[PDB]
């Protein structure tokens with residue numbers, strides 16, 4: 001029915017407010033005129049609320065009767081290349097990121113990180129990518145909100161193809177119609193991405209696919225979160241499949257989407 005960090009209730013029905021970020025505002029404005037228009041939440045412009053700027057977005061949960069939601073972070077890389085430059089010239093040591101690391105694998109931090117009780121953001125993000133499915137499959141499950149009100153973010157070590165399949169298997173709860181609709185939507189999204197003027201021109205980092213379904217077998221998928229999506233310089237383009245090597249700005253977005261369609265197609269035959 002309604003999603004209600006960055007989010008606030010909107011005046012108009014079926015809308016949601018999200019804290020304005022300049023990269024995200026640029027991106028949503030472009031996407032409304034792109035092949036991808038139908039694959040992203042409708043963007044209605046910016047509004048002021050308590051002296052601060054908000055994106056007026058379509059509430060993706062509005063069409064659904066008690067929605068189940070899964071957030072899938074897309075790409076082999078989850079940080080901008082500029083973070084790698086900043087961490088070499090002027091590292092911001094992060095003590096929070098060190099404690100999250102210790103918790104999952106106490107042997108993961110180096111002798112110096114242990115001494116620092118702190119890690120760089122890129123180091124933490126590369127580690128996160130490697131213990132989840134991000135590095136190998138080019139996406140990872142971030143979270144589920146079920147129809148019973150229960151939520152989980154317990155997916156940091158969800159890595160193998162079969163582990164990912166079991167999360168989707170539990171998420172769709174044997175609803176053949178929801179899974180068929182999800183696969184049809186993902187096939188149509190892949191086709192739209194492969195012709196999109198926006199997509200060939202932009203490095204898409206930190207974006208998610210939001211899967212939404214309900215007990216009436218309504219099912220939708222949208223791309224969300226363009227806070228780290230940046231244009232390539234002087235008419236350079238990405239294939240979004242080839243491996244990332246510092247300088248090439250490749251995100252593996254379509255490697256991810258390919259693997260995700262493969263896993264859902266496998267689940268459909270089980």
Ligand SMILES: Nc1ncnc2c1ncn2[C@@H]1O[C@H](COP(=O)(O)OP(=O)(O)NP(=O)(O)O)[C@@H](O)[C@H]1O
Pocket residue numbers: 003005006016041057058059060061069071206208210224225226227
């Ligand atoms: N347009 C939308 N309508 C309804 N729910 C949304 C919408 N956009 C995002 N959400 C929900 O809010 C969550 C956060 O979205 P996101 O755009 O990633 O926010 P963020 O705080 O900017 N980034 P992140 O750090 O990745 O969570 C999603 O996982 C959804 O559950």
Ligand SMILES: O=P(O)(O)O[C@@H]1O[C@H](CO)[C@@H](OP(=O)(O)O)[C@H](OP(=O)(O)O)[C@H]1O
Pocket residue numbers: 078100121128206
């Ligand atoms: O999911 P966990 O393991 O908690 O890690 C978190 O992953 C976010 C991306 O999902 C990052 O956000 P980002 O989109 O890069 O701004 C956070 O970074 P930050 O603390 O804000 O510098 C980072 O801690």
